[PDB]
Amino acid sequence: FEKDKATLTFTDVSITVNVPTGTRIIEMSEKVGSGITYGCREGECGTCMTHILEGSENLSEPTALEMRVLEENLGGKDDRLACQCRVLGGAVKVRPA
Ligand code: FES
């Protein structure tokens, strides 16, 4: 009934925020103090890498750009870029990678 909102848990700070769907993880991490770093405005640096603990199915699929910057920065199977990863619904749990 609230399909336009999603819960996002930053486990390094133990807080779950209810975000409007389509919000990027980086747009909440600094609001709660999570240690995810915003280091560029072009999606190329990869310093915003984030480990997706749960709920990867509720996230926007990675673009070809994200995949390239992920691989360039040794991102793993469950890592995503916080400045490019949008929460589309459901429940997601993340920690700084
Ligand atoms: S902040 Fe640079 S890739 Fe996300």
Give how many domains the chain has, as a whole number. Answer: 1
3-state SS assignment for residue 2? coil
Which of 28, 30, 40, 80 gets mutated to test ligand 1 (max ligand atoms within 8 A of its CB)? Answer: 40
**Ligand 1 binding pocket mutation candidate from 30, 45, 50, 79 (most atoms within 8 A of CB):** 45
Range of the domain at 48: 5-96
Residues 2/87, Cβ–Cβ less than 8 Å: no
Question: Residue 82 contacts by C-beta under 8 Å, 6 or more apart in sequence?
Answer: 24, 25, 26, 29, 36, 38, 48, 49, 50, 94
Centroid of ligand 1 to alpha carbon of 49 (angstroms): 8
Q: What angle do CA 47, 48, 53 make, to 5 degrees?
A: 130
> How many angstroms is the resolution?
1.7
Instruction: Name the token pair of 93.
Output: 């749990």
In this structure, what CATH number is given to the domain that contains residue 61? Answer: 3.10.20.30
How many other C-beta atoms are found inside a 10 Å radius of the C-beta of residue 26?
18
**Sign of torsion, CA 56 44 96 11?**
negative
Cα–Cα distance for residue pair 1/96, rounded to 1 Å: 30
List Cβ<8 Å contacts ≥24 apart for 27-33: 29/82
